[PDB]
Symmetry: D2
Subunit: 355 residues, 4 copies
């Protein structure tokens, strides 16, 4: 239903950075720099440019002061300068609004194309970026909870099949998804860079940004983030985890920034770069699909997500999902989940796992 | 009100083993050997004797086939052979029922005393044990989830101060506890060997055994146990965790065996050996006391625990706690907890966290 | 010196497997399966097919019984069936010997091309492969030392710039290298899959295969491999490490199989997938370039490597390196190394670091 | 031939702190605070008092500015105030020089006794100490290389059985030792607190202090210390390691402070608190006894150690070892070591393991 354009898709390398509008620049700086340990590439009174430990492009996160907290741009890096032209021609044919700046929208990025995509998300495509010192061996700066890479975005959208087809035509490959036996798709994960994903689609009212995810080297680094949050007595900002994912097989943690933007810390998924990488489909009632250890998913994780902006800086209107709700079918009043397929023992009726 | 005997206390070194009655020996073996990777010191059709990676005494766990799943004995090693005689005289003065077997109750233990202690728990005291190969450097046998030591027991009892004074007289020292402003004690941790505890008292209906705990080297070993349980599709047997404890500061996991005996896997508490080791008291309403990260404690963790047997092998009758319930005052309908004292942001009312 | 063909290079995805010839199959099986924990895809009296924990292709290593221990093939997977045709045309234009087998050289691989490449190495290109159970969440099988992926090969060749140009034309990008101030290149690392490398060139007499590398999830997994080797009283088979590499930033260990084939265990390098990824050049006299902690590199690491076979299965003749020797210029009698550039303190003259000399 | 006194031994709990004389207080501070991350309890122009992450007594390390770098005191905490009096009577009966200060020798310690012990070492015994904030849950301060406890001292002394007998009479129990088949003892480990050791005796010219050891929680913490030293371009101050010890089974690293005082970082030894804890004797030629992975012991580890002071602040005279040297019998020109006892394969004669000889 989103048609495949005749124009070639641009060659997208990876997710590269997010621009997030925040309301109190000092509080957010404290969260992202003081608590999480991200590295400042540039800052002034309006913006903070932050990067992970192993990054060499200018930034992975731009915090921009504004009146309404929201995603302003989710940016992917393309292979060549000519891929920014291809992106522009591709989104024109799709009838999408686009805006092209030879000198970039944020500091440290050159020629860039921003678009309101067919799902209502603000995508940016760019090649040119100002290189900075790669801190990958600066173990003199390395913190016990060090965030090493930007890994993915996760987007909330009402119709997952619709979005999936569009991203596949754009060159993303589905690695895992969640479905039921009645034809509904609840979520899908897709990649360009050869990890489990660069973005993911989560079925719900949208467009909204569910989260932005950063990686650590090891599982103990994620444990340390939790421990530090307890020491700072902000354990209430730990939403969910730590855990092992079923889908993706990664060790994880979800935390909430001062504007409630959700950040995931993630480590140790697997290689997906082969073009016939086997796709894995989970059943929506399988209680090990989201947390492998069967720990319950808190309802806020399903219902809460960040607003997104259009190209003019106004909030995108939210469209309701009419397909079945992952929350309702697993943990709501008429919900169901199993530990072992076909086994009544270890199954949950009308409530979440673990009592 | 448990009187201090004039007879000297036995010198207790550490918690050493538990004997657990199980209903299906083969299923239990599958859990303790095939899933958890404990090492077989002896087995036959009626019992399995198991030990941890770094142990040199005969065993840390005995699984005995019986009709009713229950704790049959929680055993402490004493410093000398004479300490068994001291234990006998001590418990006889307390008016407790005792039984002395010069050749032991279980294989690989020699002269031993079992008692029905004043809290109704079956304690064993012994010195003599058959030494076995210490597997501490057998990395050829080392599992990704390796259990390296027995760390502690945790006992459910209705009146914590009563039990705590009795254990102090036995030479245990309290390291941490949970209290409220009204003066109720909900739990206490106490030690002999210089870790946070060898046993602990949890307020509730008892005598019941809350859990037995084993230690791993590192946090990743606990993660692996969870991961393996997912792979075996037995994640419903993960009860609580993994987490960081507030009390003890240890990384932890609670799992349930086939008869619902609860096992804790535990690592990285701190040294308590100095006699003036500072005691830490947590408020019962502090949401970081049990899980430092503020994760909720599932009601089953407070309400479910194992039966204990008397010396004849019958189940000990339960006495109901009359002091306030930690479940009720934190997560029950009129309960509450906080992240930051005095702050309504991050506080939970009539409701658990997260 | 090696010309760029007019024919397009095949689109290479990644290193996929190696076929090693071994002299005693049962001894090699004990090393790779019982010691290292690799998973058996297939075996018989003549071959063992092994894979890592996260692999879905049929195998990452084939051990083949033969009279002379050697590398028989280093195989790269290509993106499409049509890329195998491209590889054939490309290598024919380079004037190399090639062999095409529609149903594969080894079990579990389909249409495959093997070539004697311009550096004398037996390369294989394939697309078609039998998928198997991907064991990535089989934590009921996971060992304390689990090998999760095949990561790279490392090749010994006498002229590194000559090979580097050829691999760049083939589509590999150099991520790191080691050079001196007098124009000599000692080593280069190059990738297709977006890690530090899929293969590497190490200057020395060749063609010889230096090692094959597998990855683990965490550093403690590499430690456990060492610990287990101690417990099995085969610590004499730990060649070098564990350590932190300067080049690649990975945590590492080198061990030796029963035929002296060198295996590296490797973890936690960085992403190189961007086309303008910064190339890092280390100076050969920098004592943190190979081991970041400054531990000395054992001389066998520089001198010993496995024979490689031609398409007929005969050993390839060795061509001697005439460029300067990394061993000689760093830890040899006229050698030099530094800890801090320009500082005499922490420098080493005619001997290795940490109080050692060449045996 | 150090007699057992009639007077009762003091009840020693554990090693508690060391007082090290250092020549440049600012440079030592950069090392212990900025590099290693210890926590400051008190400092001024003359001294810096440091503690580990889990400590509640005032300090584990006192750095005292002075003219000659040396160990000034190795302090053990005793169980009660009365035990300081027992210590005094005990050493007086041995005929040792003692000095008692009711208000301590350093800040944060109360009634204390220093003695010049029969091996020439300056020992302090105390009970009273100023309690400080226990930082064990201050994960807001926790570094990637955090030192969590003080674990042990290691002493160099010419006659190990003489020293061992004396420590046994003080209540220390031997856990492990190294010997040869002809009855020479090279080293012994002994404990009070239920870990492998609180102090250890290493055969050599002495009295000298070999090292002070701190523990970390996990192996990755020790790896981070190396990684950080590499980043700071002070890898030349990594003496030996990281490794796994044979004796003790601990993961370890040895580093050198600005005055060449050796610090060990140590983790994951085993419980020894039972009175019949099985002792383990290793053969001196076993190449897995010091490093379980067979990595060679750097010669400086055998030859270099810190001076110790007498109670007036003067350096103690050094007495030479007349028994065999561990260095000489294992890695010297006439030395040997084995991987498997009796097996020539994996054995080393006249040189160290892994292909190095002595520099
Ligand atoms: Ca030069
Ligand atoms: Cl999830
Ligand atoms: Cl708890
Ligand atoms: Cl290297
Ligand atoms: Cl050693
Ligand atoms: Fe995610
Ligand atoms: Fe416990
Ligand atoms: Fe390599
Ligand atoms: Fe030591």
């Amino acid at each position: 239903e989103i048609p495949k354009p005749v124009a070639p898709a641009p060659d997208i390398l990876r997710c590269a950075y997010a621009e997030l509008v925040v309301t109190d620049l000092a509080k957010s700086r404290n969260f992202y720099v003081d608590v999480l340990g991200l590295h400042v590439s540039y800052e002034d009174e309006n913006q903070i440019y932050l990067r992970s430990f192993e990054e060499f492009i200018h930034h992975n996160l731009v915090l921009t002061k504004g009146p309404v907290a929201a995603l302003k741009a989710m940016a992917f890096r393309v292979r060549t300068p000519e891929d920014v032209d291809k992106a522009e021609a591709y989104y024109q044919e799709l009838g999408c609004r686009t805006e092209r700046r030879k000198d970039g929208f944020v500091k440290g990025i050159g020629d860039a194309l921003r678009v309101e995509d067919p799902l209502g998300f603000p995508y940016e495509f760019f090649f040119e970026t100002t290189h900075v010192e790669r801190l990958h061996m600066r173990y003199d700066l390395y913190s016990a909870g060090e965030l090493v890479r930007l890994d993915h975005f996760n987007q909330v959208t009402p119709d997952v099949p619709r979005g999936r087809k569009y991203l596949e035509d754009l060159g993303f490959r589905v690695t895992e998804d969640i479905q039921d036996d009645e034809g509904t798709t609840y979520a899908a994960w897709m990649h360009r860079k050869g990890t489990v994903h660069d973005t993911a689609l989560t079925g719900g009212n949208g467009p909204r940004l569910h989260h932005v995810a950063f990686s650590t080297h090891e599982k103990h680094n994620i444990i340390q983030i939790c421990d530090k949050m307890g020491a700072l007595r902000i354990s209430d900002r730990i939403e969910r985890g730590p855990g092992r994912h079923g889908v993706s097989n990664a060790f994880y943690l979800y935390i909430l920034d001062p504007d409630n933007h959700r950040i995931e810390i993630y480590t140790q998924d697997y290689y997906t770069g082969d073009p016939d990488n086997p796709t894995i489909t989970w059943n929506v009632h399988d209680n090990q699909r989201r947390d492998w250890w069967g720990n319950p998913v808190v309802p806020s994780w399903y219902t809460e997500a960040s607003k997104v902006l259009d190209l003019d800086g106004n909030v995108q209107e939210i469209i309701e999902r009419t397909d079945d709700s992952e929350l309702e079918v697993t943990i709501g009043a008429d919900g169901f989940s199993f530990t072992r397929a076909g086994d009544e023992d270890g199954s949950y009726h009308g409530q979440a796992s673990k009592g």
